[PDB]
Design a protein around this ligand. Sequence first.
Ligand SMILES: CC(C)N(C)S(=O)(=O)N1CCNC(=O)C1
Length: 150
Amino acid sequence: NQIDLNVTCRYAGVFHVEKNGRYSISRTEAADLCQAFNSTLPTMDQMKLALSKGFETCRYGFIEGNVVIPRIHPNAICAANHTGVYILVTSNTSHYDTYCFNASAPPEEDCTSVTDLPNSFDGPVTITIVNRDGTRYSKKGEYRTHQEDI
Ligand SMILES: CC(C)N(C)S(=O)(=O)N1CCNC(=O)C1
């Protein structure tokens, strides 16, 4: 019973989380997942400030109200070459990655690794945080509060 959470650098407290190496998070799961990192789904304003500090990914993820990809450099296979916070307009499907916002993180680029899941609750799942540099942190617990996400 294992969940892998790949996480990024934080930029003005905003970071990206990919679960089990594929688009697999619902909107309800995303809010609960960010809560386990003492975080919330970013507002569009929080995500735009993160973008301005150096944040970009090539993956769709939830923010408050939309599913987006922050882009700095145009890349044909990432948000169809767009720059800025690209907003997903048309999709048949409901599962993506998520972004999270932690107000206590540094104001600009923080590319240190994540070494905790501070607000997970008791549960049976081995949850592993995987950093981009491969370093890992694991803990037994649960973060999903909605049965349909389990
Ligand atoms: C921004 C996230 C990824 N964190 C660095 S953390 O979840 O590990 N954590 C550290 C302790 N207290 C917190 O609010 C957050």
